[PDB]
Short mmCIF file of C-alpha atoms (C1' of nucleotides) in Angstrom, two decimals:
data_model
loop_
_atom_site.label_atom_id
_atom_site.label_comp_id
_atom_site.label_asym_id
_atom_site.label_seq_id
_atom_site.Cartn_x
_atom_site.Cartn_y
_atom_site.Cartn_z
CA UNK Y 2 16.08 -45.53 35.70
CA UNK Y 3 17.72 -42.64 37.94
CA UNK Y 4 15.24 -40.04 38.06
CA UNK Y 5 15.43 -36.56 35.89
CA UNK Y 6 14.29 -34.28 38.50
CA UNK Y 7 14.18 -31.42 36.11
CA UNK Y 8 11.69 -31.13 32.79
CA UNK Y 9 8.29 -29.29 31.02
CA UNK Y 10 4.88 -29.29 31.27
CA UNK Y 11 2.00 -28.53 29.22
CA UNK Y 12 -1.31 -27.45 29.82
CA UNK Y 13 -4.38 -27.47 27.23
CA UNK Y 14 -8.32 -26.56 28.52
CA UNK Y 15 -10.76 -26.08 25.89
CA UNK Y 16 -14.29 -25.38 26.09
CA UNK Y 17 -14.97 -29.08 26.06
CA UNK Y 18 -11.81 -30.82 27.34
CA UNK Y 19 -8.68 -30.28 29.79
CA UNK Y 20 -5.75 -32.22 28.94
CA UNK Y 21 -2.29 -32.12 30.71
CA UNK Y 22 1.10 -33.39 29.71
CA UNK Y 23 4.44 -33.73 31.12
CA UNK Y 24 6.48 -33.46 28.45
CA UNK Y 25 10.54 -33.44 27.47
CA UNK Y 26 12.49 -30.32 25.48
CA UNK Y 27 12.79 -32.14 22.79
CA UNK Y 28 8.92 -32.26 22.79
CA UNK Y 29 8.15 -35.49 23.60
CA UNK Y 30 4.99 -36.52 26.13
CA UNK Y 31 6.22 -38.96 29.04
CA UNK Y 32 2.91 -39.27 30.52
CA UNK Y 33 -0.90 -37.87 30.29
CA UNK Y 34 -3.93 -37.01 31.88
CA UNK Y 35 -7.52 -36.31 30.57
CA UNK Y 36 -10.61 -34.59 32.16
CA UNK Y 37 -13.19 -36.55 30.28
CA UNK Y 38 -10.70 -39.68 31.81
CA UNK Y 39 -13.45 -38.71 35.45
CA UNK Y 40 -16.02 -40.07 33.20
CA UNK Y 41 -17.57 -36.61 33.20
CA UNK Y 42 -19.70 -35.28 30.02
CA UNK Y 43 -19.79 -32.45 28.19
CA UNK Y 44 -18.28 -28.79 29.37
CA UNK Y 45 -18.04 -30.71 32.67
CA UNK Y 46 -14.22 -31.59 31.71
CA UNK Y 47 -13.21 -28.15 31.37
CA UNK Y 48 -14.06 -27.33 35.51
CA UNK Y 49 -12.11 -27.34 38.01
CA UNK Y 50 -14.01 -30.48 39.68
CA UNK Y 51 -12.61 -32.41 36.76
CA UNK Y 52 -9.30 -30.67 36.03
CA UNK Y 53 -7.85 -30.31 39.76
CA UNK Y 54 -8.65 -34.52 39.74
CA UNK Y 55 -6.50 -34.98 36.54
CA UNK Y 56 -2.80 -33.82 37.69
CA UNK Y 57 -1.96 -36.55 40.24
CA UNK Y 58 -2.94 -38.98 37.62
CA UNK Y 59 -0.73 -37.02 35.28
CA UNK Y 60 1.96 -37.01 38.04
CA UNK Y 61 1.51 -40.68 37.89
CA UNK Y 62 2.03 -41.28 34.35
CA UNK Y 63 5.99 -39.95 35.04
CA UNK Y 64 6.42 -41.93 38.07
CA UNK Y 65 9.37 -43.96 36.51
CA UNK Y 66 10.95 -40.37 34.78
CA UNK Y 67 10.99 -38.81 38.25
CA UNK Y 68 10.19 -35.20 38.21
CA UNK Y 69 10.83 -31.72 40.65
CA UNK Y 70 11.31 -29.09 38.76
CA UNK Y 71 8.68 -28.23 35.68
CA UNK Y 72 8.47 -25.48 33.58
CA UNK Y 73 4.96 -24.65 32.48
CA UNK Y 74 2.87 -24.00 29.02
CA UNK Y 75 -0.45 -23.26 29.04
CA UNK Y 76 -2.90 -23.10 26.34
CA UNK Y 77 -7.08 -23.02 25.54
CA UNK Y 78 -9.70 -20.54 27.36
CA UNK Y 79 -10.77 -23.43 30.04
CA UNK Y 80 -11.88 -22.40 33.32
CA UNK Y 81 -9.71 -25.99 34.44
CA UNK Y 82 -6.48 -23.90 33.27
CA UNK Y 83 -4.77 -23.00 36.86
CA UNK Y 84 -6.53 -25.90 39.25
CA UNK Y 85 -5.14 -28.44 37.73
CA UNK Y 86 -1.22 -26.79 38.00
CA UNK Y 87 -1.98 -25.65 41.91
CA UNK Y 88 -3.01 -29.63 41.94
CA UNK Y 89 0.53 -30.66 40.69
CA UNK Y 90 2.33 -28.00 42.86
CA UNK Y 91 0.40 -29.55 45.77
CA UNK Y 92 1.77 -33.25 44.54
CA UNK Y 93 5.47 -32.08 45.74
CA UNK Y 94 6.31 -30.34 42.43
CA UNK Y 95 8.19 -27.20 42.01
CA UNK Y 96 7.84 -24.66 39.37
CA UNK Y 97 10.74 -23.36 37.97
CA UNK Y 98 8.74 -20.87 35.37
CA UNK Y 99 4.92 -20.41 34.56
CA UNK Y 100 4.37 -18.97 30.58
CA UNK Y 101 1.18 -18.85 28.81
CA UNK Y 102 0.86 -19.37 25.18
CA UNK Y 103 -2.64 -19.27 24.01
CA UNK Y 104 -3.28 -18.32 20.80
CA UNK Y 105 -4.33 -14.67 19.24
CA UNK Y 106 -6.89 -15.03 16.43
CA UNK Y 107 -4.67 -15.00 13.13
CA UNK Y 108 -6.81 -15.81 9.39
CA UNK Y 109 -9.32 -17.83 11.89
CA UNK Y 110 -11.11 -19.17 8.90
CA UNK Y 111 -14.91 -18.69 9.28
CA UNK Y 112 -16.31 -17.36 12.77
CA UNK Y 113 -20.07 -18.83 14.00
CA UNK Y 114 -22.14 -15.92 12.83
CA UNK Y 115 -24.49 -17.37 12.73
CA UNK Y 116 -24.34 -18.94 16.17
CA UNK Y 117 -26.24 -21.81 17.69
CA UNK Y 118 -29.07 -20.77 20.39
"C1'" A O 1 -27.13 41.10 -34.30
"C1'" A O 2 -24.08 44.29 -31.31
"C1'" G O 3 -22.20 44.69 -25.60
"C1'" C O 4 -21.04 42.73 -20.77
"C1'" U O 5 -20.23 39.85 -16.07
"C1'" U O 6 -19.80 39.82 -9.83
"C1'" G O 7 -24.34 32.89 -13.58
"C1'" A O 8 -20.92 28.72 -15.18
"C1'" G O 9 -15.53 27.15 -16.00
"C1'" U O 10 -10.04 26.36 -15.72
"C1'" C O 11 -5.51 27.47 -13.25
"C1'" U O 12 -0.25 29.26 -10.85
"C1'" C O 13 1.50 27.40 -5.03
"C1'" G O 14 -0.85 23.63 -2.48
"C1'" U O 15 -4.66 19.32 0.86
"C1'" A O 16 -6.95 14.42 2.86
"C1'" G O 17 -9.03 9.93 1.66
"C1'" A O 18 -10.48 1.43 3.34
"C1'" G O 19 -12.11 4.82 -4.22
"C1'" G O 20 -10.39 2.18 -8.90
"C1'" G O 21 -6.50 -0.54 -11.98
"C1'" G O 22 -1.77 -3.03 -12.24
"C1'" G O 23 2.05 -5.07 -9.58
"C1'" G O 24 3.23 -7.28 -5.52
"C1'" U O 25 4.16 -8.65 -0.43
"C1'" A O 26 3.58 -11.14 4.84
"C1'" G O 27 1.76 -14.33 8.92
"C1'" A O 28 -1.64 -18.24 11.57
"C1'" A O 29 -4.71 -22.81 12.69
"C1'" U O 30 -8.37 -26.74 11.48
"C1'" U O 31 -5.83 -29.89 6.94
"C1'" C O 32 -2.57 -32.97 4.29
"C1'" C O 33 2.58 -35.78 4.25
"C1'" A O 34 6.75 -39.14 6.84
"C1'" G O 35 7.85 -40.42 11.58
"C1'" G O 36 9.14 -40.16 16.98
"C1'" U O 37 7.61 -39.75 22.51
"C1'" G O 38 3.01 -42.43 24.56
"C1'" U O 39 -1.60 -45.06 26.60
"C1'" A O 40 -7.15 -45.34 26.21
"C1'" G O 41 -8.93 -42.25 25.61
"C1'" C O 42 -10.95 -38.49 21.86
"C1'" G O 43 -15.32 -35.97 19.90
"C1'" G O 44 -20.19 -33.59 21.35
"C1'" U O 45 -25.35 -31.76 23.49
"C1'" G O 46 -30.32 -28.85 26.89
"C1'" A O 47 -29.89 -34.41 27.25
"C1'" A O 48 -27.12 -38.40 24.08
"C1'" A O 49 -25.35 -41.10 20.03
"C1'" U O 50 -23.45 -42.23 15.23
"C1'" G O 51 -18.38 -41.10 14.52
"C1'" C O 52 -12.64 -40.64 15.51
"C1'" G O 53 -9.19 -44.48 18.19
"C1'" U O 54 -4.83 -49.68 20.03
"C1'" A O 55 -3.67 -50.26 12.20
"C1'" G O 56 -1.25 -46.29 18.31
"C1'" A O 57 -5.76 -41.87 18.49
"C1'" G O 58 -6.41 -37.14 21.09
"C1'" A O 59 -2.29 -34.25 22.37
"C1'" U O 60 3.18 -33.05 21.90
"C1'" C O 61 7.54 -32.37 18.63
"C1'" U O 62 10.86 -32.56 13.79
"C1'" G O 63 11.09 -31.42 8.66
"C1'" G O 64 7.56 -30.22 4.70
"C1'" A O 65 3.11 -29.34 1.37
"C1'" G O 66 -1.94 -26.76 0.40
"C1'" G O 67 -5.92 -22.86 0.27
"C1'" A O 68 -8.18 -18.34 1.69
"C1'" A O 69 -8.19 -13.75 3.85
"C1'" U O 70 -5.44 -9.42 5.22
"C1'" A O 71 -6.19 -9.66 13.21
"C1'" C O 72 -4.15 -4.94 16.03
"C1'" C O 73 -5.18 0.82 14.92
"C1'" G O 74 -10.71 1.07 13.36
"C1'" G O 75 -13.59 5.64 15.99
"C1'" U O 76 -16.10 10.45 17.43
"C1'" G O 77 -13.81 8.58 11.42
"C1'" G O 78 -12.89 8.75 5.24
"C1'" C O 79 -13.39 7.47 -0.05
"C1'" G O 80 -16.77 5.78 -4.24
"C1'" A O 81 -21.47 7.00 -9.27
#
RNA sequence: AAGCUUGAGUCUCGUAGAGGGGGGUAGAAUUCCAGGUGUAGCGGUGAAAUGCGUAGAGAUCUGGAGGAAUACCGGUGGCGA
């Protein structure tokens, strides 16, 4: 129960959800927060208004790891994809690296065409 | 019929091309497969709701299977009947 004070994070906003871990090297996820967990619907819980409200409550979700220094993945398109880590540096967190890792377009399958209007 | 070539043709040394055929040859995620870490959320629309989820989802990792197409350069561009 001594506190770890060092560790990862891991960021994911997609055009419909934001959803933050703090996570171990090993990749586990110690603890979890959701934008859709605001009760907000839709696109909503990929905004800022939704994601900057969902890293304290991830920051909570650790608060028997103990955390300080995080170093940072981040995924997805989401506009929620830098609030929500200002949010957790605001919390008393320090950020040892930032990286992003969003993915380039590789096979992709089948694209909307053919898109809904 | 006899006579020609400066109509037509083939070629010495050489030129580009996503053309065809046969071979290959390489990578990614939705998925599937066996589990961990972990808690109530996930999914989705102009609005919502069936539905996925506590049988432990979503997500995050370990080791692995499956199928298709060939990102970038790529255009002011080539080739092919």
């Amino acid at each position: 129960r001594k506190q770890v004070s060092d560790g990862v994070a891991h960021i994911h906003a997609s055009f419909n959800n934001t959803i933050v871990t703090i996570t171990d090297r090993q990749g586990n996820a110690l603890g979890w927060a959701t934008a859709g967990g605001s009760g907000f619907r839709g696109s909503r819980k990929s905004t800022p208004f939704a994601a900057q409200v969902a890293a304290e409550r991830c920051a909570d979700a650790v608060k028997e790891y103990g955390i300080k220094n995080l170093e940072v993945m981040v995924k997805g398109p989401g506009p929620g994809r830098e609030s929500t880590i200002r949010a957790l540096n605001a919390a008393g967190f320090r950020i040892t690296n930032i990286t992003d890792v969003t993915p380039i377009p590789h096979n992709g399958c089948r694209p909307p065409k053919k898109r809904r209007v």
